[PDB]
């Protein structure tokens, strides 16, 4: 399980990749 805070709006949400 991996998650990153993206720089694309709206805001910097988290996406769990892998």
């Amino acid at each position, epitope marked *: 399980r991996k*998650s*990153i*805070r*993206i*720089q*694309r*709006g*709206p*805001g*910097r*949400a*988290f996406v769990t990749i892998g």
Partner: antibody, heavy 119, light 112 residues
């Protein structure tokens, strides 16, 4: 713990290129994208852009797109802010703040950095 | 882009009186049931502290006296108990659409 120890207190000259460095100790970096805010004198903040170490993606401002090159240094967890052709009207207080806590605004800002122009 | 035309940039508020820093936006900065409007408290020679985020979602760190009432474009910073700690300039940065920008600012000068 985490902290953004940035350094950029230089007396830039009209037509110079100073390369700043915002270090991130106790940081994940790739997960925490960094944004820069330019405060020309005692005025409001101006979001100049952002950066992502994971995908190496940036979002510069339509006015400063290309002038500010954000170099990647995942090895030292530091993002370089190479300001090229700095004009006399570029005296501002930069801040490399990120959205460490909430995913809306930045909570951990830089440790204060200002570039003064000789002329 | 969105213009954050805030209310009277400079004003005086005595200790105890409530302040009203309304940040009006030209465009809708709201999302799916979540507004993206942040407020910072840039103290004299100090980085802008993240007071409120997501329109009215208090930032874990500051007291429960920094309320935020705003929908779409009409936003406001309701600071009922204006203590001495409110001696800083408040800015409203919209993070809904690019490019992200801040507001004119509001140098809140407390009064003894």
């Amino acid at each position: 713990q985490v902290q953004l120890q940035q350094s950029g207190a230089e007396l830039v000259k009209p037509g110079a290129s100073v390369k700043m460095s915002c270090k991130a100790s106790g940081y994940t970096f790739t997960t925490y994208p960094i944004e820069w805010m330019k405060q020309n004198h005692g005025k409001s903040l101006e979001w100049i852009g952002n950066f992502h170490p994971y995908s190496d993606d940036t979002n510069y401002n339509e006015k400063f797109k290309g002038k500010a090159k954000l170099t990647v240094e995942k090895s030292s967890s530091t993002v370089y802010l190479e300001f090229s052709r700095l004009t006399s009207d570029d005296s501002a207080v930069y801040y490399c703040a990120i959205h460490y806590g909430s995913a809306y605004a930045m909570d951990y800002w830089g440790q204060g950095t200002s570039v003064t122009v000789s002329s | 882009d969105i213009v954050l035309t805030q209310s009277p940039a400079s004003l005086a508020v005595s200790l105890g009186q409530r302040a009203t820093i309304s940040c009006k936006a030209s465009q809708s900065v709201d999302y799916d049931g979540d507004s993206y409007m942040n407020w910072y408290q840039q103290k004299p020679g100090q980085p802008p502290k993240l007071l409120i985020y997501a329109a009215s979602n208090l930032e874990s760190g500051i007291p429960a006296r920094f309320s935020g009432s705003g929908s779409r474009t009409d936003f406001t910073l309701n600071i009922h108990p204006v203590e001495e700690e409110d001696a800083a300039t408040y800015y409203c940065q919209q993070s809904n659409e690019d490019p992200f920008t801040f507001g004119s600012g509001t140098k809140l000068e407390i009064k003894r």
